[PDB]
Structure 1
Amino acid sequence: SYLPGYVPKTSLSSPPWPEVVLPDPVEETRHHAEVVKKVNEMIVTGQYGRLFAVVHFASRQWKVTSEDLILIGNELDLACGERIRLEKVLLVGADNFTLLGKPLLGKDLVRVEATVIEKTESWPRIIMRFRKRKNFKKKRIVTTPQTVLRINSIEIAPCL
């Protein structure tokens, strides 16, 4: 007995993509609990090394690790050699695991520590305007302030 709505196997009867069944929320939830527990005990025991982070800073996102240098394009109201905490960490990861925030990770979970190690200027940038047959020609030279930060440490804590 063919059910009402049975269409025979033709080339356009079924959609071309394979049918996907998603696992049900109950055993998926306990499976998420097991995976979170496993990653958390990996964090507790310390089976990781050379963490990296994706950090939102000064309208940018930087993929940093420990012992890094980044060149922020503005002054930062900070003396040289000054340790600060990068806080807006979108991602932290290692070999064998990776933590993703939505969109920002918790401040109890990950801490990025950097240090202002240079306050300098950029090389002189040239701004020239020219329009032909209109006698239009202007020249300006700008020099943006810059700040070199050294990313010292990326720490994660068991909070999952």
Structure 2
Amino acid sequence: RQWKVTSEDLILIGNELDLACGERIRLEKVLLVGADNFTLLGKPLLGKDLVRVEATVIEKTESWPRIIMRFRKRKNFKKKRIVTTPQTVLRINSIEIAPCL
């Protein structure tokens, strides 16, 4: 799934990546990056050497308890279940672009 992001901004994902807390990661896929007076759109994405999007993993929760109830009428069909999906909080530390173009 997509996200609009910048630097110094938080972001959440609904799964675990198997990354220890505090580690940095370089993201490969970017659809576009844009500055105050121009924009760099891809076909579909931009090149690897063009950008370097670095982000740190800071925090990992079990999701708040999401309750589900499946019910049907006048037939005694009912059930309960509570899920706590894993979540991870990333932050894009900084973004930079290369002179190659």
Structure 1: distance between partners of 2:20 and 2:48: 25
- Deviation, structure 1 residue 135: 0.3
- Deviation, structure 1 residue 86: 1.1
Structure 1: distance between partners of 2:88 and 2:68: 22
RMSD of aligned alpha carbons? 0.6
Post-superposition CA distance 1:117-153 (Å, at most 9, x none): 0111110001101101110100000011000001101
- Deviation, structure 1 residue 159: 1.1
Question: Can you give the 5+ residue segments of structure 2 that lack an aligned partner in the other structure?
Answer: none
* Equivalent position to 2:64, from 123, 138, 159: 123
- Deviation, structure 1 residue 113: 0.5
Q: So what's the TM-score if we normalise by structure 1?
A: 0.62
Q: How many residues align?
A: 101
- Deviation, structure 1 residue 79: 0.2
SS in 1 for 2:100: coil
Structure 1: distance between partners of 2:23 and 2:49: 22
Q: Which runs of 4+ in 1 moved over 4 A?
A: none
Please list, as runs of the form range in 1=range in 2, the aligned pairs for 1:1-160 lying within 5 A after superposition: 60-160=1-101
- Deviation, structure 1 residue 63: 0.7
Structure 2: distance between partners of 1:159 and 1:98: 15
Structure 2: distance between partners of 1:95 and 1:65: 13
- Deviation, structure 1 residue 115: 0.5
Structure 1: distance between partners of 2:72 and 2:87: 32
In proportion to residue count, which structure has more helix?
1
Identity, % of aligned positions: 100
Question: Can you give the 5+ residue segments of structure 1 that lack an aligned partner in the other structure?
Answer: 1-59
- Deviation, structure 1 residue 69: 0.4
- Deviation, structure 1 residue 83: 0.3
